[PDB]
Amino acid sequence: ASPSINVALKAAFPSPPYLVELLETAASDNTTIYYSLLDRIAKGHFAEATTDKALYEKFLEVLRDDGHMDPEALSAFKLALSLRTATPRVEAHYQYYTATVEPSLSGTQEGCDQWFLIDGEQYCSPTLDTSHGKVKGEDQLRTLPFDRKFGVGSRDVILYADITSKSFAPFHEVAMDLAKKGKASYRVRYRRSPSHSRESLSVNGYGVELVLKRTDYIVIADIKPLEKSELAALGMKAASFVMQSEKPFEALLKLTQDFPKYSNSLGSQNVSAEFEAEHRGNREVFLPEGSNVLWLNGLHLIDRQIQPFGLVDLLTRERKLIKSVLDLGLTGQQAVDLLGHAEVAHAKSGDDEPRRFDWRDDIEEGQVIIWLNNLEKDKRYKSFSPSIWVLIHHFGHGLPQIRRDVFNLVVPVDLTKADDVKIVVEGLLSFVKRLIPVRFGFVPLTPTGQAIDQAKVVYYLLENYGLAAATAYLEKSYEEQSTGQPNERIFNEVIKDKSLRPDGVELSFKDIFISEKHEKQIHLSKHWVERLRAGGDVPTVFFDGFPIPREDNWLRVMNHRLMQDLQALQQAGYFGMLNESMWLPGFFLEKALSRRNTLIFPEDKNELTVLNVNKIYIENHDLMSKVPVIEASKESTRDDWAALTVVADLDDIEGQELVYYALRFRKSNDGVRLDIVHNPKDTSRSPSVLAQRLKSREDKLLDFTRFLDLETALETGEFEPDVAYDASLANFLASSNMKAGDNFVILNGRVLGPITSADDFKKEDFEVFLQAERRTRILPVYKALEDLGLDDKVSGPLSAAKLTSVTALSTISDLPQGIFDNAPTVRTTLFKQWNSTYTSFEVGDASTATIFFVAVINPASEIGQRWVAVLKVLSELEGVHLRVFLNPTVMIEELPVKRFYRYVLSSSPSFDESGKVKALSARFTGVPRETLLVVGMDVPPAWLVTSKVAVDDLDNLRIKDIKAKRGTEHVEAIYELEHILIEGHSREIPGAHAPRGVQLVLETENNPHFADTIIMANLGYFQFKANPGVYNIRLKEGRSSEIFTLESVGAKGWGPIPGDDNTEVVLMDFQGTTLYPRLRRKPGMEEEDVLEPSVSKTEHAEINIFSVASGHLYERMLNIMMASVMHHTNHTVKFWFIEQFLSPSFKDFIPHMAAEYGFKYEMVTYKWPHWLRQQKEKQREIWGYKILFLDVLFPLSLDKVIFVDADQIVRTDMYDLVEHPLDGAPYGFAPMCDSRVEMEGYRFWKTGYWANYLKGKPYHISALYVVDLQRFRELAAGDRLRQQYHALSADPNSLANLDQDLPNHMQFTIPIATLPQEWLWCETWCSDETLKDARTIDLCNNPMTKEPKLDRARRQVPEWTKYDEEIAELARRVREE
């Protein structure tokens, strides 16, 4: 009975058969569930269910009966099935099939509904006797994202099937059995089934908004009744209403959806209830008032992640993690509590800190470092104070002089190399002479004969008294040509000054063989260099235990840490942490490690891979119950416990050397539990044999002394290859990121590798690896775990590893830090402090729940409207707990909620009277008749949406008008999910920077030019508009491919994850595709694309004009604008439109305008980037579209474009604007009229701000402008517009009209070609005498009038009606056609 508004969304691809959709939804990523169900339907088991409901009903019984899903997983299945999450995954198959299979399968297909593909040969029969073809094109055997494999087999077999028919069942069984035997590996690909209809897909998981477009009025339903200054209490009174209500969750939803309507209805019946002002004790401690914050098991979620799809993927990932933990008898509550524990988060913060290594001589008994200083005893520094306050009282960029030991620098030098020697002589000594407060040491490098000798020479001379003498040899040797070999001619003169007085020393060129000098000194030195990996092609310098490689201005690097260390000391001093009797260098050495490994301590701190240990022993039980295992000792302590697994190629010296070290390390550490996985490069000989050789010798392996005993044990014994072991072996490596013949080391789930050389990982390297790993991951788990009293659950080394490994996985970055939010992956428990009695309500059983949600919603917020709606539906799921906190603000200067909101989502599928799946829609009932409303779509980030069906003006909705024009109080509108985004964040390799101005091309096997875009400066951002299918990204041929080669598109993650050296993208989800591509510069390039070392016309048109209209009137005016151009030019014109702001009525009309006026048209759009600052106000969005995305909105093939406003009319042949010289400027604009005499008052660009800023430059008009696009992109103007906009936009009152104001603010930075004013006329600011020579007319809003735009047009232009009549009769001609 009530006046209603209904909005629905449909996808750009037809609905896949329900059967296949349930198969896919059901088996998310578990293959066993997939083929176990594929058997069931090939029985013909699912043939007897006639309707979708019955079919759905059948799946529930099956899954429950076969043990596939438990209540928790079943509930999750229903929600994912409502969401229709599997539909794009199925469409990926079809698009792949349509575009790569059919054109590479030459011949005549009839009866070949299904067909296996074997060795590039097609077989239409199960009996496999005859083969139709040699399939053309690239290999289809490439394993791609949507593939499934069943079994391991030398041969690879693919079946392209239409499951729907019964013709499928025998083909399946042929290859299912063939795989069950082990002849070949089986996989299913889909074929679009013609039994099913080509009806489009009805989607859900989006939001609809009805925005009040008139907010200006402030002091069943007709119009909202407003309110005076009492705004301040809205949030507060709104929060109370709910608390009081009795069924609070429902209230919030009912209140929050129709909130603008209930504003005046608040403040009634002794409303405030001031008990809830008690809990600002909880605002005093943690979050600011009116802020929306969501947590999922401690994880703080960003707004983008708060949609149904984003949330389904998070549960899926989270449950996998927790379930792993709760097989050790922990409740979901206990598991989460452990993950977010204080001791755990402390460790992440702990090793976010920079790493230092112990540079001391202590281990090598003080005989390796030859210091050029001592600050406590050098009689250079005698003058200086040895006081702590000297440090603390130092400001500036310098360094305080002090007689104390505080800063140290040890530099390893090769005495053969001139450049290396030069460092000590010039570099190091100057610093000494200069009285720098840094102690300087150096240790010689011994990698060649001559080097060994020269270390001996210098070292020995020093050891047993010589100082200045050794220095002297070095200096003389360096200056005296270039000595990279000992020179006696030079050496002998140095000795001539007989300063060798302090206690007897040997003399001559006998390069000493003294067991003390040659052996101890040189071997001790080598032990220091090896220990800290301080040698090689690139040696390593240690400043305060901080490794700085000896490359390009390392002293610049040193100075940076020198200042950073000094500031670190000062802070401790002002807090009185420091005292006078202290060794200051040991403030840094507190956490320093004795040994240094680049694998354990990579310089890229993020580089970390951890595997779920429970998973490893669950998936590969067949493998891991038959690997040689050294159990960790019976009588060792929990603190000692650790689990180690070594993966190695025992058919290589490095592979077996690595294992010998691991075995050696095990003898020493009784607590470790060792596993050996033999991973061979060549699988001609079964891997099971060598594993079987060792497990027999398992008792006897740890009981030995020599390497050959291990070598010999590998050779001896006769064994039967367990091919079942071999299968689980190759599955393990595939699941883990591991190649064949590659060496890896796994301690408590953490993987290091591949190990290229076994000298990289020695016995001493395992010891530090355990020491470091122990610290971070094991000790924080142990403490935290014990604090909760769950320390009964640890029963051994393998038992422990399950927990430590899981908690390490919980804190993994992906989504990468610095992209969506800078904040680290730390699970807070910080809201547990909050009192809950009067602001919170919970839904779900906390005792059973695996998912714990903590929502902090401000009822007065518009963001809250969506949050409540989504959370209600996720709250309905079994095994989920939710707790809500309401936190309003007292700061309400403007109206809080200015829209109505509906979320299209269900927790389980709904069925028809005919049993078909119910489509979902947003229905607003009892809409006020007199309020002007705007329809908006609040769609997931990867989606691009436009109106398809609507007869109404969605930008100007009023029920009274529709009733008085259409006769109906009921409105229906249908949208189309036209595109889904492929978006990514680029980087250059190895010196990672965003490659800006790089051009990209998206392609498919059908067409090599799907789309094109250019790389942005901000996060190396780029995007493509696409739908489900298999694509490829090639750098655009030209300057881009000249400078770069892209190794990869980051489809696996930030990585590099091995196996991702690919350029293939596929989208099979409603979340699109997120990519992290990598591009490495070609041989010796410091080049830039942006600077140099009839095409567009042919492709498009002579003239390219683009525009936007946001209403039926403005669209009607746009029709006139296009016509005026056409009458005024006999040239070829192409029109470009901003697709999403236009009505379907307009959209359905243009082909008819194009036939009549003879122009070409193209619809364009771009999705507003996530990083780029949003516009809550639609009019402002539109303005942003005209200026911010000029370089990326139009295809690269377009040389230039012209913007003409909708209300405009043109009397000129528009080419002239193209031919207009821009004198090296990217875009051209027309200025504001000065000609009108008496208008001055309203000319605001002659005021202080605009006249001070625009020193001499004009105040330009955004109604008309030219963009020399080739130059625009070449100058990279867009990036500058975007970052200045983002920076300026922080202030809300910054840009009144951004479109005009941005080019004006940027005309100093970016040239603006100024146009002849013959190019623009407006009555408001130009005289009537001016219009004779006027080229085009804008209808600028007169502010001294209220005469409407329709009136100005008829009065101002007499030919306006002539244009309108033409359109009017044509519209009727079409309607009567």
Ligand X SMILES: *[C@@H]1O[C@H](CO)[C@@H](O[C@@H]2O[C@H](CO)[C@@H](O[C@@H]3O[C@H](CO[C@H]4O[C@H](CO)[C@@H](O)[C@H](O)[C@@H]4O)[C@@H](O)[C@H](O[C@H]4O[C@H](CO)[C@@H](O)[C@H](O)[C@@H]4O)[C@@H]3O)[C@H](O)[C@H]2NC(C)=O)[C@H](O)[C@H]1NC(C)=O
Ligand Y SMILES: *[C@@H]1O[C@H](CO)[C@@H](O[C@@H]2O[C@H](CO)[C@@H](O[C@@H]3O[C@H](CO)[C@@H](O)[C@H](O[C@H]4O[C@H](CO[C@H]5O[C@H](CO[C@H]6O[C@H](CO)[C@@H](O)[C@H](O)[C@@H]6O)[C@@H](O)[C@H](O[C@H]6O[C@H](CO)[C@@H](O)[C@H](O)[C@@H]6O)[C@@H]5O)[C@@H](O)[C@H](O)[C@@H]4O)[C@@H]3O)[C@H](O)[C@H]2NC(C)=O)[C@H](O)[C@H]1NC(C)=O
Ligand Z SMILES: *[C@@H]1O[C@H](CO)[C@@H](O[C@@H]2O[C@H](CO)[C@@H](O[C@@H]3O[C@H](CO)[C@@H](O)[C@H](O[C@H]4O[C@H](CO[C@H]5O[C@H](CO)[C@@H](O)[C@H](O)[C@@H]5O)[C@@H](O)[C@H](O)[C@@H]4O)[C@@H]3O)[C@H](O)[C@H]2NC(C)=O)[C@H](O)[C@H]1NC(C)=O
Ligand U SMILES: *[C@@H]1O[C@H](CO)[C@@H](O[C@@H]2O[C@H](CO)[C@@H](O[C@@H]3O[C@H](CO[C@H]4O[C@H](CO[C@H]5O[C@H](CO)[C@@H](O)[C@H](O)[C@@H]5O)[C@@H](O)[C@H](O)[C@@H]4O)[C@@H](O)[C@H](O[C@H]4O[C@H](CO)[C@@H](O)[C@H](O[C@H]5O[C@H](CO)[C@@H](O)[C@H](O)[C@@H]5O)[C@@H]4O)[C@@H]3O)[C@H](O)[C@H]2NC(C)=O)[C@H](O)[C@H]1NC(C)=O
Residues in touch with ligand X (CB under 6 A): 281-282, 285, 833, 835
Phi-psi region of 81 (alpha: psi -120 to 50; beta: other; left: phi over 0): alpha
CB of 376 to ligand U, least distance (A): 17
Residue 827 in contact with residue 855, Cβ under 8 Å?
no
CB of 1130 to ligand Y, least distance (A): 3
Q: Is 515 in the site for ligand Y (CB under 6 A)?
A: no
* Among the listed residues 21, 337, 420, 1338, the single contact to Ca ion using CB under 5 A: 1338
Which of 1374, 1337, 1364 lies closest to 1120, judged by CA? Answer: 1364
Q: Is 1287 in the site for ligand U (CB under 6 A)?
A: no
Residue 949 in contact with residue 85, Cβ under 8 Å?
no
Q: Exposure pattern of 1247-1286 as b/e (b: 16+ CB <10 Å)?
A: eeeeeeebeeebbbbbbbbbbbbebbbbbbbbbebbeebe
Q: Is 1205 in the site for Ca ion (CB under 5 A)?
A: yes
Residue 1001 in contact with residue 1035, Cβ under 8 Å?
yes
Cβ distance to ligand U smaller for residue 201 or 569: 569
| Strand order across the beta sheet in which 999-1003 lies | 1011-1014, 999-1003, 1029-1035, 1064-1067
Between vectors from CA 69 to CA 63 and to CA 73, what angle results, nearest 5°? 130
* Residue 60, token pair as written in the block: 């529930």
Cβ distance to Pt ion smaller for residue 513 or 575: 575
* 250 to 247, 490, 905: CA distances (angstroms): 6, 94, 16
* 1063 to 1045, 1046, 1075: CA distances (angstroms): 11, 8, 10
Residue 281's binding partner among ligand Z, Ca ion, ligand X, none (Cβ under 5 to 8 angstroms by kind) is ligand X
Distance in angstroms (rounded) separating the CA atoms of residues 591 and 430: 32
Distance in angstroms (rounded) separating the CA atoms of residues 144 and 1249: 59
Cβ distance to ligand U smaller for residue 580 or 715: 580
CA 939 to chain centroid, in Å, comes to 19
Residue 12's binding partner among Pt ion, ligand U, ligand Y, none (Cβ under 5 to 8 angstroms by kind) is none
Q: Which amino acid is at 1060?
A: D
Q: Give the phi and the psi of residue 34 in degrees, each rounded to 5.
A: -65, -60
Interface with ligand Z by CB under 6 A: which range of 30-38, 92-100, 310-318, 1046-1054?
A: 30-38
What DSSP character marks residue 126?
T
1317 annotated to a ligand binding site: no
Q: Is 32 in the site for ligand Z (CB under 6 A)?
A: yes
1136 annotated to a ligand binding site: no
Cβ distance to ligand U smaller for residue 581 or 705: 581
Residue 822's binding partner among ligand Z, ligand X, ligand Y, none (Cβ under 5 to 8 angstroms by kind) is none
1110 annotated to a ligand binding site: yes
CB of 1359 to ligand Y, least distance (A): 15
Distance in angstroms (rounded) separating the CA atoms of residues 336 and 808: 13
Beta bridge partners of 840: 885
Q: Is 961 in the site for ligand Y (CB under 6 A)?
A: no
Residue 1168 in contact with residue 1075, Cβ under 8 Å?
no
What DSSP character marks residue 103?
G
1179 annotated to a ligand binding site: yes
CB of 1034 to Pt ion, least distance (A): 22
961 annotated to a ligand binding site: no
Cβ distance to ligand Y smaller for residue 163 or 1202: 1202
Q: Is 1263 in the site for Ca ion (CB under 5 A)?
A: yes
Enumerate residues 563-592 that contact Pt ion by CB under 5 A: 563, 572, 575, 577
Distance in angstroms (rounded) separating the CA atoms of residues 593 and 359: 9
Interface with ligand Z by CB under 6 A: which range of 65-73, 217-225, 245-253, 1225-1233?
A: 65-73
Residue 936 in contact with residue 1178, Cβ under 8 Å?
yes
Distance in angstroms (rounded) separating the CA atoms of residues 1065 and 984: 11
* Among the listed residues 33, 135, 144, 584, the single contact to ligand Z using CB under 6 A: 33
Place of tokens 């429902």: 250
Q: Is 397 in the site for Pt ion (CB under 5 A)?
A: yes
* Residue 159, token pair as written in the block: 């079946």
Distance in angstroms (rounded) separating the CA atoms of residues 540 and 558: 12
Residue 1130's binding partner among ligand Y, ligand X, ligand Z, none (Cβ under 5 to 8 angstroms by kind) is ligand Y
Contacts of 723 (CB under 8 A, 6+ apart): 182, 686, 688
Distance in angstroms (rounded) separating the CA atoms of residues 917 and 932: 34
Q: At what angle do helices 1298-1305 and 1178-1187 cross, to 10 degrees?
A: 40
* Residue 938, token pair as written in the block: 């609040």
Enumerate residues 1054-1073 that contact Pt ion by CB under 5 A: none
Q: Is 515 in the site for ligand U (CB under 6 A)?
A: no
Handedness of CA 1330, 1335, 1339, 1343 (dihedral sign): negative
Residue 582's binding partner among ligand U, ligand Y, ligand X, none (Cβ under 5 to 8 angstroms by kind) is ligand U
Residue 68's binding partner among ligand Z, Pt ion, ligand Y, none (Cβ under 5 to 8 angstroms by kind) is ligand Z
1293 annotated to a ligand binding site: no
Residue 66's binding partner among ligand Z, ligand Y, Pt ion, none (Cβ under 5 to 8 angstroms by kind) is ligand Z
Distance in angstroms (rounded) separating the CA atoms of residues 760 and 658: 9
Residue 285's binding partner among ligand X, Pt ion, ligand U, none (Cβ under 5 to 8 angstroms by kind) is ligand X
Residue 33's binding partner among Ca ion, ligand Z, ligand U, none (Cβ under 5 to 8 angstroms by kind) is ligand Z
Q: Is 66 in the site for ligand Z (CB under 6 A)?
A: yes
649 annotated to a ligand binding site: no
CB of 36 to ligand Z, least distance (A): 7
Interface with ligand Z by CB under 6 A: which range of 25-33, 184-192, 623-631, 1291-1299?
A: 25-33
| 3 state DSSP class of 237 | helix
Residue 177's binding partner among ligand Z, Pt ion, ligand X, none (Cβ under 5 to 8 angstroms by kind) is none
Distance in angstroms (rounded) separating the CA atoms of residues 1255 and 308: 52
Enumerate residues 550-579 that contact ligand U by CB under 6 A: 579
Q: In the chain, helix, strand, coil percent, each to 5? A: 40, 20, 45
* Among the listed residues 467, 468, 505, 582, the single contact to ligand U using CB under 6 A: 582
Question: Mask of contacts with ligand Y, 839-868, x by CB under 6 A?
Answer: ------------------------------
Cβ distance to Ca ion smaller for residue 405 or 1205: 1205
Question: Mask of contacts with ligand Y, 1120-1159, x by CB under 6 A?
Answer: ----------x-----------------------------
1114 annotated to a ligand binding site: yes
CB of 287 to ligand X, least distance (A): 12
Max CA pair span of the chain? 120
* Among the listed residues 961, 1213, 1234, 1318, the single contact to ligand Y using CB under 6 A: 1213
Place of tokens 């399968």: 105
1338 annotated to a ligand binding site: yes
* Residue 732, token pair as written in the block: 């393990």
Residue 1221's binding partner among ligand X, ligand Y, ligand Z, none (Cβ under 5 to 8 angstroms by kind) is none
Residues lying near ligand Z in the complex (CB under 6 A) are found at 30, 32-33, 66-68
Binding residue numbers: 1110, 1114, 1179, 1183, 1186, 1205, 1207, 1299, 1338-1339, 1341, 1349
Residues lying near ligand Y in the complex (CB under 6 A) are found at 1130, 1213
Binding residue numbers for Ca(2+): 1205, 1207, 1338-1339
Residues lying near ligand U in the complex (CB under 6 A) are found at 579, 581-582
Residues lying near Ca ion in the complex (CB under 5 A) are found at 1205, 1207, 1263, 1338
Residues lying near Pt ion in the complex (CB under 5 A) are found at 397, 559, 563, 572, 575, 577, 819
